[PDB]
Ligand binder design. Sequence first.
Ligand SMILES: C[S@@+](CC[C@H](N)C(=O)[O-])C[C@H]1O[C@@H](n2cnc3c(N)ncnc32)[C@H](O)[C@@H]1O
Ligand SMILES: C[S@@+](CC[C@H](N)C(=O)[O-])C[C@H]1O[C@@H](n2cnc3c(N)ncnc32)[C@H](O)[C@@H]1O
Ligand SMILES: Nc1nc2c(c(=O)[nH]1)N[C@@H](C(=O)O)CN2
Ligand SMILES: Nc1nc2c(c(=O)[nH]1)N[C@@H](C(=O)O)CN2
Ligand code: SF4
Ligand code: SF4
Ligand SMILES: [Mg+2]
Ligand SMILES: [Mg+2]
Ligand code: NA
Lengths: 209, 209
Amino acid sequence: TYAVKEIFYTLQGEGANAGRPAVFCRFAGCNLWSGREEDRAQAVCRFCDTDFVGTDGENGGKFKDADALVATIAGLWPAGEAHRFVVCTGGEPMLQLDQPLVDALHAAGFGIAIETNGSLPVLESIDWICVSPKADAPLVVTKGNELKVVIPQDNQRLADYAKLDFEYFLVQPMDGPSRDLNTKLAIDWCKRHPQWRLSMQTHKYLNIP
Amino acid sequence: TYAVKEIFYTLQGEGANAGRPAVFCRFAGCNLWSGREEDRAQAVCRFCDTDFVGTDGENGGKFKDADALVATIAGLWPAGEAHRFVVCTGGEPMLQLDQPLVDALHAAGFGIAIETNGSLPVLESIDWICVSPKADAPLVVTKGNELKVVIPQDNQRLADYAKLDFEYFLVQPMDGPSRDLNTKLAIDWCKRHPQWRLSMQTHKYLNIP
Ligand SMILES: C[S@@+](CC[C@H](N)C(=O)[O-])C[C@H]1O[C@@H](n2cnc3c(N)ncnc32)[C@H](O)[C@@H]1O
Ligand SMILES: C[S@@+](CC[C@H](N)C(=O)[O-])C[C@H]1O[C@@H](n2cnc3c(N)ncnc32)[C@H](O)[C@@H]1O
Ligand SMILES: Nc1nc2c(c(=O)[nH]1)N[C@@H](C(=O)O)CN2
Ligand SMILES: Nc1nc2c(c(=O)[nH]1)N[C@@H](C(=O)O)CN2
Ligand code: SF4
Ligand code: SF4
Ligand SMILES: [Mg+2]
Ligand SMILES: [Mg+2]
Ligand code: NA
């Protein structure tokens, strides 16, 4: 059983795969925030820009098994076209993503990406692992493909993140009332510490889902 | 001897390396347009968004040899930082970029990217080869890292490009009076033919050089 907020076909807006066509599968629920506004100020992760509460979005629902979810995912892909790619997100996808879903996605020809806060162990048969550490939460995933850090956060040891085992190290400006401010901070950080690259939320500039 | 319009340190705005700190070395001159506005309407490449005429830009000039050019490029990199990366552009860089320049940049710790219109042979020792084919020019570079196609151009055979030997296939919307239209075109193209990915000119959205 999977509880999914929404499933939609678009371009990956963020990270090293930005611009790439992908089905997004947004799981409902997170382990660092209830998703309720009354709880935000007290949450472990307090800056979230996403609605992940419930199963009422586009193609959202409770899926009885893996095959059912994969059928909905595959159905959104253009007919006759390869390069199938799904981004498992949320919410915190590692609350629900399991080996049977991964195996069924692969069997259907999908490459698999995950967006995870890094507080839960990941399945290493996932093809692309993106970890986005929250400064007040534990980080138990210390290796993957890209480490995408949202900045600024209090209590952050930003330069130390570079000692972890990732292919790409990215900073992403925190969206909110200070986005242009944070974008200037993030550009300056990379230029001073060029191991790091800038990840924009391009879908917000493109105004696409 | 090298004629350089400008040299500057910023983030790569385009392609698969978008977001990455880089020294841009913009060579003066192109083989597909004189760079004069009165010639634009009759040129082979007519949509250019760049000023590549003369050597009067920031750090621009005539460099007596490779060592002199490399010294200026190296001097823009943050002191004590590695991951040195230079993007050779213009203009058409393959009018001037030769083996001794490539060797000197490599000796100075630089990885080398090129932005080329593909109408001229490129040096295989270049680390990152980006080809941007112009519809009314010969295309002799048929292998590389990324093929970044500006759309729409008349006479374009877009699907044919995907048969070439590149790792990444990107469409980049043509800036000009129809940039928003063209962006929607490019997004739709990728979603219909997901071998292709979108390349935004992010430096124009971030308002950075
Ligand atoms: C909503 S999270 C879902 C996946 C998982 N919960 C995580 O945090 O990675 C998707 C991505 O957007 C980032 N994000 C969330 N809120 C953001 C904000 N206000 N500004 C910028 N990025 C944000 C997250 O850090 C993460 O990289
Ligand atoms: C100015 S060219 C210099 C390198 C080489 N002459 C070339 O054409 O690739 C730099 C890059 O910007 C792209 N470009 C130029 N004018 C553009 C425009 N109006 N809109 C979008 N991309 C453009 C080119 O296609 C190329 O990929
Ligand atoms: N197009 C698009 N790409 C995204 C997001 C989103 O909401 N839209 N947000 C992030 C997510 O929710 O995983 C990552 N990339
Ligand atoms: N930041 C930045 N990145 C760029 C460009 C540019 O002008 N600025 N234009 C392109 C170029 O001139 O080669 C490639 N990417
Ligand atoms: S961990 Fe991810 S899904 Fe949960 S609140 Fe933070 S950004 Fe949102
Ligand atoms: S080939 Fe490149 S540099 Fe020359 S006019 Fe066209 S876009 Fe500009
Ligand atoms: Mg989101
Ligand atoms: Mg330019
Ligand atoms: Na901080």
